Ligand binder design. Structure first.
Ligand SMILES: CC(C)S(=O)(=O)N1CCC2(CC1)C[C@@H](NC(=O)NCc1ccc(OC(F)(F)F)cc1)CCO2
Ligand SMILES: CC(C)S(=O)(=O)N1CCC2(CC1)C[C@@H](NC(=O)NCc1ccc(OC(F)(F)F)cc1)CCO2
Ligand SMILES: [Mg+2]
Ligand SMILES: [Mg+2]
Lengths: 319, 319
């Protein structure tokens, strides 16, 4: 599928708070579709969807989420709690003069768009998530208890203390992205052993090979983007579990009534498809897509199937 | 009518040539409407139309034209001939993934949008001009002969030699804009005496009064914008008469077949309404608006009537 050259894009910037500007890339005309990437990615992670959605008749806005790329990275950890992140996206729509938009997120971005749909339905024409399920807050179980209970979420403890994971992620950026951005069968990391081994990469190659998903050029674009602000801002998305839990609890009971799509990936061994199994009980108009042979990096793993699922669903439920 | 605060706008940038980026402001959703200002103005000159068109259901893109504000100002004089300016606007639409757009221009911007409609009809959904008529190139009359024949176009000779008018326009920017941006009854300049007096402002106040059209704050925004690149780039729009004439001649015969609106201003004593009198012969689907008591600075002189004329015409002919 057609990709993107970063230098031939239209670049947009919106100030949503005194020292916070969000950067995005924009392509196409039609209903506005906002794309929200995950950790540790970029607007560029949508490079295969952006020209496809625009050719299908949508106005695509691919964010650099806060902390990333050309968007501002404020230093304070609580600037990255879901409550602030969602209220900034609303301000983003306001400054763009958009009454509502389709939100499509992946990974942490999928988490963000669920909470946009939950707390700002009036601003969300429709919502889609890749990999990230919507699980309502359990008011009787803390986030720390919910982690220790999924041995695969163990890496999020290693991510907690400011400075620690930054050092490993930033020490050889090309090694970081070559190690993360891989198909499931090429994976060199065990997220369920990270905290005792002492790090994400302690037991993976010094000079890793290039995954079949990515080129050296695409790797170097991510490298150059993260040289700007580093990994602190991105890592701060994990450092607000208690705040996010408390805020999510304030919503308990209410359903998401807008058109919705959950896309699961067969080989995502962190965000496994079964974690989505009862979303219907909370989201009554929910439709589904499922992609076989697809790992965590869904947009670049299986871009053609992602494009088909998204365009089919936008044409029938968002328009 | 609602105006614009510059700091609360979404700002967009598109690279159309190696060292040429165009900056624009963007507001709203719906069919794309591109607004092209005149000399010596700014995207901000549309401050009263931008929120009004967006509230009426259009996606507004207000350009900083080349040479102005935050858009690039290349040093070469022939970078500002209509042929290059129009081909850059086409590239602008391309990089934004827009098949076509409504073009609305004023003054030199109105000249630009006529030639867009003439040479790129396929990219222009509809075209509107304020004040600037469309006169087909006369192949048997040079631009210099056509000027000397309108004594009111005399100031364009003073604008020809690089450096000369720059010095007068840039010597006291606040005096420049306070002297230009006035209602017709408050006007302090005689454009038909400029070349013998030796300058635009030689016979007008040292500290001019503030016109009823503008605030001191709005004046200071124009001042700060023109401090960036000065008046060379803007003045170069007048320094390509022979090139523009030759290029315009290459089109002779052909009509403009797309939906079109010509808005004339009763008190514009340079671009007088009668200069538009036979545009119907070349533009068969042409509709008209006319605004009484309105001078050259139409958008800020009579913003409510401009908004009414434009929204009425967009709803019936552009949509
Ligand atoms: C569970 C609670 C603690 S939670 O409710 O707080 N909660 C839910 C789970 C959670 C966090 C918050 C995961 C977030 N995403 C990532 O962390 N992505 C990193 C990553 C990297 C590499 C990789 O590669 C592979 F291992 F090969 F697959 C896979 C994943 C998205 C939002 O949600
Ligand atoms: C005629 C040929 C030589 S031409 O074919 O080459 N040609 C047509 C005429 C022409 C130029 C090219 C005028 C251009 N606009 C201006 O120059 N605006 C400046 C201005 C400033 C102050 C002011 O204030 C007032 F006097 F009080 F009213 C009025 C106007 C737009 C494009 O077209
Ligand atoms: Mg159920
Ligand atoms: Mg006639």
């Amino acid at each position: 599928p057609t990709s993107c050259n970063p230098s031939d894009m239209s670049h947009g910037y919106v100030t949503v708070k005194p020292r916070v500007r969000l950067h995005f890339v924009e392509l196409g005309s039609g209903p506005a579709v906002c794309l929200c990437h995950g950790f540790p990615e970029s607007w560029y992670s949508w490079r295969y969807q952006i020209p496809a959605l625009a050719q299908a008749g949508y106005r695509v806005l691919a964010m650099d989420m806060k902390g990333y790329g050309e968007s501002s990275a404020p230093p304070e950890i609580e600037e990255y709690c879901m409550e602030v992140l969602c209220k900034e996206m609303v301000t983003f729509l306001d400054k763009l003069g958009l009454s509502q938009a389709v939100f499509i997120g992946h990974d942490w971005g999928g988490m963000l768009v669920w909470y946009m749909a939950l707390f700002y339905p009036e601003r969300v024409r429709a919502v889609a998530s890749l990999n990230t399920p919507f699980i309502p807050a359990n008011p009787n179980m803390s986030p720390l208890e919910s982690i220790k209970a999924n041995p695969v979420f163990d890496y999020q403890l290693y991510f907690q203390e400011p400075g620690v994971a930054e050092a490993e992620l930033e020490q050889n950026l090309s090694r970081t992205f070559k190690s993360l951005f891989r198909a499931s069968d090429e994976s060199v990391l065990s997220m369920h052993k990270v905290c005792e081994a002492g790090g994400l990469f302690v037991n993976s190659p010094e000079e890793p090979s290039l995954s079949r998903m990515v080129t050296e050029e695409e790797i170097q674009f991510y490298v150059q983007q993260f040289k700007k602000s580093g990994f602190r801002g991105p890592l701060n998305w994990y450092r607000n579990m208690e705040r996010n839990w408390k805020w999510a609890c304030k919503s308990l009971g209410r359903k998401i009534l807008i058109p919705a799509l959950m896309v699961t990936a067969e080989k995502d061994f962190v965000l496994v498809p079964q974690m989505s199994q009862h979303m219907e009980d909370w989201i009554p108009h929910l439709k589904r897509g499922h992609i076989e042979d697809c790992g965590h990096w869904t947009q670049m793993d299986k871009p053609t199937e992602v494009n088909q699922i998204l365009i089919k669903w936008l044409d029938s439920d968002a328009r």
